[PDB]
Structure formats: structure tokens, C-alpha cells
Automatic annotation (TrEMBL):
Full-protein residues shown: 36 to 287 of 307
The protein, known as: D-alanyl-D-alanine endopeptidase
Record bears the keyword Signal: yes
Source organism superkingdom: Bacteria
GO terms classed as biological process: cell wall organization; peptidoglycan biosynthetic process; proteolysis; regulation of cell shape
Length: 252
């Protein structure tokens, strides 16, 4: 049984949903930008047009007040691109804006986020807003595993989340911004990744969730509350080695 530097983790075999590894998997903690996976699912569940040009809007998200972003308020970009920026780059204004263009309004969006959690058996999970900036967006490694299992039903989420980088062009006014994936493993050919999302807040620590393949075995990996910007990636690498070869490695 390998040791991890992070506060909690869970790895599941996606062939059978069997738990391969668990470390404090029921510890309830904030999850930061991992929230954006749920946000993406809520958008797709309603089958809102992906090509629709939407305005950046943070009116109803008090958690975004005074938070820096390069995505300008009232500028426009497609729903699909907002999903992309939210998932690949953890762009908060893009995630927030998605909830401002939802049938029934912003609070209907939050209801849908919590309704899905319940429907997925994520009984220790709560969402209050779509970005993950709120310390009240909480879950457990076990619940996040359920979210990952459910993400298999949303191929676009996986596609978009693994995009290495892209230039995003906005309208009103015309400007282009460079964006890059928060997970550098998408640039490493020895990693086979179907879905990725990172997160960081001091309350949540560094967080990482992935759907990946280790020697033909598809797995769902969750690492939460890592101190140090590479500690969660180091944990993931050490667990991979253990899964693939059986060799337990110490925590450096």
C-alpha cells in the first residue's frame, strides 16, 4: 500500500468500478476548479446550442468580484469555447458565464448541479456556484470518482479538457487570448489521457482528477489537497508505477 503526499486520493478501475487505491476517500473538502467538470455536465445535459455566441457575465457570481481575469466582461465567444476555456485552462469567467445563459436562470443552474450530484450518489458533495472559487463547493475523493465515472457519458468534456493549447478569439470588442492546459501531462506522449481537470485554492490545496490508461487498464484518478504545485503530479506518477509494476515508492 503506497503512501501519498496529498491529503486524499482514490483510484478506480473503470472496467469494473473496483477501488484500486484509496487514501482518506471520504474526507469532505473544498474542490476548487474540479467544480468546472459539473458545470460542463449541467450545460451539456440541457443540450444548449454549442455554437451560440454568449456574453461574458459574472453579475450573479459574488465569488468573482475582485478576481483577476483576462476574459473581458460583455465580450462574446461561443458556448463551446466557454466550455473549452473552463476545462482546459480553468478560466473562471468562462465557467461563471455558462451559468448566466441557462434556462430558468443562474439559480436553476446551481439547482441542476446539486440535483446531478444527488442523482450520481455524491452524497457528501455540495455546490453553491459554478467556478469552484467558493470554499462551500465541497466533495470527497469517493464522490469525485463517481463524477469521473459519469464523465464517460460526455465525450466532449474529455476532448476539450485534454486540449493542449488554443488561441481564443472574442468579439465585442475583437481580441484574441492565448490559453494552455493546466495539466502539463497533455504534452507528454507517455501519458494517455481521456479527461483532465486540475484545481487549486489554499482551502482545497492542489487537486487533480483524470481518466487515463495504465498498461491497457482505464482508470479514474483523484488526488486532493496537495501542498506544492507538483506534489499531486508526483503522487499520480508514483501510483501509476505501483499500478503498472507493483513497486511501491516512498514519498519524497
Amino acid at each position: 500500500q503506497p503512501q501519498i503526499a496529498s491529503g486524499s486520493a482514490m483510484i478506480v478501475d473503470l472496467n469494473t468500478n473496483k477501488v484500486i487505491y484509496a487514501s482518506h476517500p471520504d474526507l469532505v473538502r473544498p474542490i476548487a476548479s474540479i467544480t468546472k467538470l459539473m458545470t460542463a455536465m449541467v450545460v451539456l445535459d440541457a443540450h444548449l446550442p454549442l455554437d451560440e455566441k454568449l456574453k461574458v457575465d459574472i453579475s450573479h457570481t459574488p465569488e468573482m468580484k475582485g478576481v483577476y481575469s483576462r476574459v473581458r466582461l460583455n465580450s462574446e465567444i461561443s458556448r463551446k469555447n466557454m466550455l473549452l476555456l473552463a476545462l482546459m485552462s480553468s478560466e473562471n469567467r468562462a465557467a461563471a458565464s455558462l451559468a448566466h445563459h441557462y434556462p430558468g436562470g443562474y439559480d436553476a443552474f446551481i439547482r441542476a448541479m446539486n440535483a446531478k450530484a444527488k442523482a450520481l450518489g455524491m452524497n457528501n458533495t455540495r455546490f453553491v456556484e459554478p467556478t469552484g472559487l467558493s470554499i462551500h463547493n465541497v466533495s470527497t475523493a469517493r464522490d469525485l470518482t463517481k463524477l469521473l465515472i459519469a464523465s464517460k457519458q460526455y465525450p466532449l468534456i474529455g476532448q476539450l479538457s485534454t486540449t493542449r493549447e488554443e488561441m481564443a478569439t472574442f468579439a465585442n470588442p475583437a481580441y484574441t487570448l492565448p490559453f494552455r492546459n493546466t495539466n502539463h501531462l497533455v504534452y507528454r506522449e507517455n501519458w494517455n489521457i481521456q479527461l483532465t481537470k486540475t484545481g487549486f485554492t489554499n482551502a482545497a490545496g492542489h487537486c487533480l482528477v483524470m481518466r487515463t490508461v495504465f498498461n491497457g487498464k482505464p482508470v479514474a484518478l483523484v488526488v486532493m489537497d496537495a501542498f506544492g504545485k507538483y506534489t499531486h503530479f508526483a503522487d499520480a506518477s508514483r501510483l501509476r508505477t505501483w499500478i503498472e509494476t507493483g513497486k511501491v515508492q516512498p514519498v519524497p
